[PDB]
Each structure stands twice: as structure tokens, then as C-alpha cells.
């Protein structure tokens, strides 16, 4: 089937909250403009991530029914999805079309940003896997909402209440996948399968950050709450 009137409303509404994020070029312009030291990149990363968590909270609050969830559950979902949302947004930005030779330079600059070699590999492997899916803006917006309303999260007391909120977004995403790519009845499951690779960034995020090739690792207090560093 096609999107119902209620599903088009939900999609446009998720699209509008999603678009409140910092524009991709505002990020890639800076990285492409000039090379920075690992210390300068660490501060660009922390300020980008503080802004991102801030916007992600506002995005999450707008998710239909999120406000009706238990307060402890609301916190558990935010804390359980922030790192994954950041890397999915980083993958969205990375795979955006740029002039000839720019993506190569952007990739070289990230590679030499100060991040440990141990982490460059699974990071770029994930970004390229996302790239092969040729996701639309709507697919990234719905995937981000689905990542956030994950009932299979740690410390969630009422899973069914979270399941009820995720299921309608999973349905809109499925219908969208079927339309945009009739050529791949696997599209929906590939998109859902990438979400499993995304979770792996949770376990090693703290070590990825602490191994940044800088002398001091300062984070903002909002990032200490979310990332559990410092």
C-alpha cells in the first residue's frame, strides 16, 4: 500500500523536527577549508556533539507519545541512543554529494583528525555501508526516530509502551522502502541490519574518545552525562 493520511502527517512532522539540525555543509565546509591539529579537532568534535545532543533531546520530545512515557524510561532511551544517533548523522553527512575530489579530501581529513587507527576502520566500514543504501532524507529521519524508540534498550521498565511508539514509524519506513526501491525487497531489512552495526559504537565510544591523540581530554558536563567520560 501507499502512505495513509495519518502516515504522511507523521512523516512530514518527523521531517520538520529532523531539519532543525545543523546543516551538513556547516560541518564539511570547516573540515574542508583547512587542516587542523588533533587538539583543534577534539574541540570541534566536542562542541558539535554538545549541539547535537541538545537538538536530539528537542527531536525526541517531539516524537509522538514520547512525553507520555515514564520519566526514568525517557532518560534511558536518550542515554541509550545518543552515540548511535551521532554516528548515524555523521554517516548521513559523510555520504552527501560534494564537488569532485571533495569526499576524498573530507575522508583524509577525518582519518587524520586525531582518532586512533583502531577506530578509523570500523567507523569508515559503517559509513560506506550506509552509503551503499542510498538513503533519502526521510529514511535517515525515520531511522533516527526508530533508533531512539528502541524497546530492547537497557534499563527500560516498560518495553511495550516503547514498542507501541516504534511500530508506527517502522510501518512508515517499510512502506517508504517498498516505494523508493521496488528493485530491492531487501531494502527494509538492510536498513534494519545496519542498526546492529550502529550498536557496536556504544561499547567502544569511551575508548575511541580517550585514545584521541591529544594530551588532555576535556568534555562538556552535558557530554559527561551522555557519554560517561570524565
Amino acid at each position: 500500500m501507499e502512505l495513509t493520511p495519518d502516515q504522511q502527517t507523521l512523516l512530514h512532522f518527523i521531517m520538520d523536527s529532523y531539519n532543525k539540525q545543523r546543516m551538513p555543509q556547516e560541518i564539511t565546509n570547516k573540515i574542508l577549508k583547512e587542516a587542523f591539529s588533533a587538539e583543534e579537532n577534539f574541540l570541534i568534535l566536542t562542541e558539535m556533539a554538545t549541539n547535537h545532543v541538545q537538538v536530539l533531546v528537542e527531536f525526541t520530545k517531539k516524537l509522538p507519545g514520547f512525553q507520555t512515557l515514564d520519566h526514568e524510561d525517557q532518560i534511558a532511551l536518550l542515554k541509550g541512543s545518543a552515540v548511535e544517533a551521532m554516528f548515524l548523522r555523521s554517516a548521513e553527512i559523510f555520504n552527501k554529494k560534494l564537488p569532485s575530489g571533495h569526499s576524498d579530501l573530507l575522508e583524509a581529513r577525518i582519518r587524520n583528525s586525531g582518532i586512533s587507527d583502531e577506530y578509523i576502520t570500523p567507523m569508515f566500514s559503517f559509513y560506506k555501508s550506509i552509503g551503499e543504501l542510498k538513503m533519502t532524507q526521510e529514511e535517515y529521519a525515520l531511522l533516527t526516530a526508530i533508533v531512539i524508540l528502541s524497546p530492547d534498550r537497557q534499563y527500560i521498565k516498560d518495553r511495550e509502551a516503547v514498542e507501541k511508539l516504534q511500530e508506527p514509524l517502522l510501518d512508515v519506513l517499510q512502506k517508504l522502502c517498498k516505494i523508493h526501491q521496488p528493485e530491492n525487497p531487501q531494502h527494509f531489512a538492510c536498513l534494519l541490519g545496519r542498526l546492529t552495526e550502529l550498536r557496536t559504537f556504544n561499547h567502544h565510544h569511551a575508548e575511541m574518545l580517550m585514545s584521541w591523540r591529544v594530551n588532555d581530554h576535556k568534555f562538556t558536563p552535558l557530554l559527561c552525562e551522555i557519554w560517561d567520560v570524565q
Binding site: 541538545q54 533531546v57 520519566h71 532518560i75 536518550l78 542515554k79 558536563p221 552535558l222 552525562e225 551522555i226
Partner: peptide
């Protein structure tokens, strides 16, 4: 108290 900045942003 553990996630006070996060609880503050969720309420506001």
C-alpha cells in the same frame, strides 16, 4: 542527580 542536565532538558 546522575543525569541532571538531561532531566532538565527533558522537562524545561
Amino acid at each position: 542527580k546522575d543525569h541532571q542536565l538531561l532531566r532538565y532538558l527533558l522537562d524545561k
